[PDB]
């Protein structure tokens, strides 16, 4: 039953590891858009979900059937895969190659620490991967509403920022066999925060949802009075591309100047004029190794697409 449920206003976290007393910061990062939808997975189960930019794995079960997750790209013996598993009183992470939890032959990576399941109940876990890192943020809160996300506010705090350096594209949940959650995706957005008195985020506003939010984001405030305040601009975007290089198609030689013997002395140098042709400089690469291809005028990469008089 993959029914959809509203996520309300939940998913914010501390973006930087610094302390701010009472400000209204304006960040720009991957977040979960406000008032979005998330896919309940009441449980044949355990689909292999995609990993686009991030995940917002939220759970509300107490019996702790939910063990760690599996992260990979091929999820086979060709590429490495994370094997986060929660112990009884430990946390285990492995990185290197796996087949089916059963080989783990090449490589070995390890890290142990306190469990993630100390503690109805509600748990959140944000997974992000940038510049060869792996950021996970968690925060446990008690509610009794049931199978729905509470309409409250609660930020998250970092747990570990271990570096790996692996492509990640596939995400799977792992449960204990012998002895339910929500998934929502992250997109690049701009937020405005409300550090109250102790670096405790008490409010936040998303700057791309409604016009009122846009105005509240232009001038840094949470209250606006009567006015005609201005905001950003709009511009139509193009659809297609057209290039019209000239009619002619003949290829000038451009080659006898390159392969020859006894060109000239340094004085009385011969001058060759080349025009009325279309030529490519890739054939120049098909030549003897260059003592110094370093050159002054224009970048060699875009020389292949230019128009000249002579």
């Amino acid at each position, epitope marked *: 039953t*993959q029914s*959809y449920t509203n996520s309300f206003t939940r998913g914010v976290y501390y973006p930087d590891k610094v302390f701010r007393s009472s400000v209204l910061h304006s960040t720009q990062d991957l977040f979960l858009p406000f008032f*979005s*939808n*998330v*896919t309940w997975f009441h449980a044949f189960d355990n*689909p*292999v*979900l*995609p990993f*686009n930019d991030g995940v917002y794995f939220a759970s509300t079960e107490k019996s702790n059937i939910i063990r760690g997750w599996i992260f*990979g*790209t*091929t*999820l*086979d*013996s060709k590429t490495q895969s994370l094997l986060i598993v929660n112990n009884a009183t430990n946390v285990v992470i492995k990185v290197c190659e796996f*087949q089916f939890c059963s080989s783990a032959n090449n490589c070995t990576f390890e890290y142990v620490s306190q469990p993630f399941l100390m503690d109805k109940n509600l748990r959140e876990f944000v997974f992000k991967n940038i510049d060869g890192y792996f950021k996970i943020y968690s925060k446990h809160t008690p509610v009794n509403l049931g199978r729905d996300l509470p309409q409250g506010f609660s930020a998250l705090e970092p747990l570990v920022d271990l570096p790996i350096g692996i492509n990640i*594209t*596939r995400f799977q949940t792992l449960l204990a066999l012998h002895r339910a959650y929500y998934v*929502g*995706y*992250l*997109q690049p957005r701009t937020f405005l925060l409300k550090y109250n008195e102790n670096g405790t985020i008490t409010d936040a506003v998303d700057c791309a949802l409604d016009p009122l939010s846009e105005t509240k984001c232009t001038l840094k405030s949470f209250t606006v009075e009567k006015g005609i305040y201005q905001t950003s601009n709009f511009r139509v975007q193009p*659809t*297609e591309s057209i290039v019209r290089f000239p009619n002619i198609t003949n290829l000038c030689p451009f080659h006898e100047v390159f392969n020859a013997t006894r060109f000239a002395s340094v004085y009385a140098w011969n001058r060759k004029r080349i025009s009325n042709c279309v030529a490519d400089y890739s054939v120049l690469y098909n030549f003897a190794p260059f003592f110094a291809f370093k050159c002054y005028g224009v970048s060699p990469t875009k020389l292949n697409d230019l128009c000249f008089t002579n």
Partner: antibody
Framework: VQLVESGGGLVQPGGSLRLSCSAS????????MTWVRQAPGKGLEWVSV???????YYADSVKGRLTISRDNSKNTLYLQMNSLRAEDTAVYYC??????????????????????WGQGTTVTVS | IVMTQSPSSLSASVGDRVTITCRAS??????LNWYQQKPGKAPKLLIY???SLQSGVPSRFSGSASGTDFTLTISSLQPEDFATYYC?????????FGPGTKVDI
């Protein structure tokens, strides 16, 4: 249950075409349908798809030119082709897909495969 | 997502079995379809979900999946089974097709 196509012809470059895929036993109101283009002896390549909800998702290559559209009942969807670059001369088929849900923040992922195929129509550019 | 077929050219005789296989790039679980393209007329669907049958054809056709490698099995390669074979992934919206496989006498 069967569906067949019409509307082909030889058209000069930079023209306009409007192919029609008409179905008999498959309602177009709530279904997933798609178009497949086959160049002569070069394999197949999906080019456009429309879902039950009514959204569209074209391929990367033919983007901003083709346009799929669905008729309110009458079981005959229409694919409109804009300016052509002498490459789209090929055989076109319309088909139906099984199903898959709508993970928000992404597209439709879990599909099974096509079930019914037409005979297709040939489009040529001079 | 890119898939390749191997071998591309199939040459056998009557009462034999096929061992063509499809090789993916990312993980697509067990979502792969085998299509039979007749030489000119229209494609036909045989195997979906990498293990099931459309019930059009008898049990002579079967599909096996292991990890992210997929294989097709034909019990008896009768003379009427001579066409092109394709493997298509369906894990994503943007479908993708294989280069193609040729069956020869």
């Amino acid at each position: 249950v069967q569906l067949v196509e019409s509307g082909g012809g030889l058209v000069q470059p930079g023209g306009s075409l409007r192919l029609s895929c008409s179905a008999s036993g498959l309602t177009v109101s709530s279904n997933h349908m798609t178009w497949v283009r086959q160049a002569p002896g070069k394999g197949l390549e999906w080019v456009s798809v429309i879902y039950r909800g009514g959204s569209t998702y074209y391929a990367d290559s033919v983007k901003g030119r083709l346009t799929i559209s669905r008729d309110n009942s009458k079981n005959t969807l229409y694919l409109q082709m804009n300016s052509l670059r002498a490459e789209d001369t090929a055989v076109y088929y319309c088909a139906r897909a099984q199903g898959g849900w709508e993970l928000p923040g992404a597209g439709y992922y879990y599909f099974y495969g096509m079930d019914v195929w037409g005979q297709g129509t040939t489009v040529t550019v001079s | 997502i890119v898939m390749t077929q191997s071998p591309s050219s199939l040459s056998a005789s009557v009462g034999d079995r096929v061992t063509i296989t499809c090789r993916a790039s990312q993980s697509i679980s067990t979502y792969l379809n085998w299509y039979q393209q007749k030489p000119g007329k229209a494609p036909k669907l045989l195997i979906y979900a990498a293990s099931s049958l459309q019930s059009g054809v008898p049990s002579r056709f079967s599909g096996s999946a292991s990890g992210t490698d997929f294989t097709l099995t034909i019990s008896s390669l009768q003379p009427e089974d001579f066409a092109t074979y394709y493997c298509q992934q369906s894990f994503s919206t943007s479908f993708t097709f294989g280069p193609g496989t040729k069956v020869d006498i």
